[PDB]
Amino acid sequence: GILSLALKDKPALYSAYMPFVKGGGIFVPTPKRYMLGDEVFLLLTLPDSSERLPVAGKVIWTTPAGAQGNRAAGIGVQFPDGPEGEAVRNKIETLLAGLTTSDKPTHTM
Amino acid sequence: MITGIARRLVQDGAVEEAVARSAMDQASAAKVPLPQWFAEKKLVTASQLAAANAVEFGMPLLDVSAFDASQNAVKLVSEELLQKHQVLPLFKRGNRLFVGVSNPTQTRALDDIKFHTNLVVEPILVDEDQIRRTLEQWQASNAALGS
């Protein structure tokens, strides 16, 4: 029951980051079906490091299989507010320095 | 014979196979659009119906309660359109205005918003209740910035 997401570089991190979530979010592509609100555990690798960051999050977004557009199936995971989550949002926001204002589309919005 | 959201709602375990057959049968008798039937008959919840709507139409579903209200896009759409359609504009990125909807066939609202806004409008599923509650909250927040 342990998701893993590894983001090789800054583009991939940009596609995955959900800046419009409270506390921050990450999109995780998965064929597994999840309900909104499910608590879920993620092992996240950001592109600057091989460190794997545990993230205990609630599901807040889903994309179904065979979704319109070239949209990829998965779930959006809200970082828990509090130190643990705020660290991961922060790391993502500085890695994405210079792309925060981009127009390019994402896995979510 | 169970197909549509009727099929998905029992996939997702939202309601029994027997009571889904009823709804197909009676919504055919009434000549009523099936998902409205489910919704108005209160056989499943607004979020249950939306989860099936999503898997059924290849459309993404979002929990707005996690959406950071300070980033909303409600202000880009007239209040007049906001009344005529129960929709919840969410977020701008570049061209795109993502607009939450409770019904994925509800194309009239997307064209009216495009024309009004001259942006690219993509829909996102938000369930019917969250649209109602969250719209009015986001309007309270925006109102704190001035007349």
Residue numbers in the entry:
A (entry chain C): 9 to 117
B (entry chain B): 11 to 157
What wording appears in the published article?
Type IV pili (T4P) are thin and flexible filaments found on the surface of a wide range of Gram-negative bacteria that undergo cycles of extension and retraction and participate in a variety of important functions related to lifestyle, defense and pathogenesis. In Xanthomonas citri, two cytosolic proteins, PilZ and the c-di-GMP receptor FimX, are involved in the regulation of T4P biogenesis through interactions with PilB.
To better understand the three-way interactions between PilB, PilZ and FimX, we determined the crystal structure of the complex between PilZ and a PilB fragment (PilB12-163) corresponding to the N-terminal domain of PilB from the phytopathogen Xanthomonas citri that causes canker disease in citrus plants. Native and selenomethionine PilB12-163-PilZ complexes were crystallized as described in Materials and Methods, in space group P21. Two native crystal datasets were obtained, one with the wild type sequences and another with a spontaneous P70S mutation in the PilB12-163 subunit. The asymmetric unit contains two copies of the PilB12-163-PilZ complex (chains AC and chains BD) and the overall structure of the heterodimeric complex is shown in Fig 1G and 1H. The PilB12-163-PilZ interface buries 1026 Å2 and 1018 Å2 of surface area for the AC and BD PilB12-163-PilZ dimers, respectively, as calculated by PISA. PilB12-163 is made up of two sub-domains, a four helix ND0 (α1-α4) and an α/β ND1 (a β1-β3 antiparallel β-sheet surrounded by three helices (α5-α7) and a string of three consecutive short 310 helices (η1-η3)). The most significant difference between these three PilZ structures is that the electron density for the last 11 PilZ residues (residues 107–117) is well-defined in the PilB12-163-PilZ complex, while no density is observed for these residues for PilZ alone and in the FimXEAL-PilZ complex. These C-terminal residues (called motif V, or MV) are highly conserved in X. citri PilZ orthologs, including PilZPA2960 from P. aeruginosa, and are required for the interaction with PilB but not with FimXEAL. Specifically, in the PilB12-163-PilZ complex, the carboxylate group of the C-terminal Met117 residue of PilZ makes a salt bridge with highly conserved Arg103 of PilB while the Met117 side chain fits into a hydrophobic pocket made up of PilB residues Leu72, Phe77, Leu100, Phe101, Phe108 and Ile134 and conserved PilZ residues Phe28 and Trp69. However, the F101A/F108A double mutant no longer interacts.
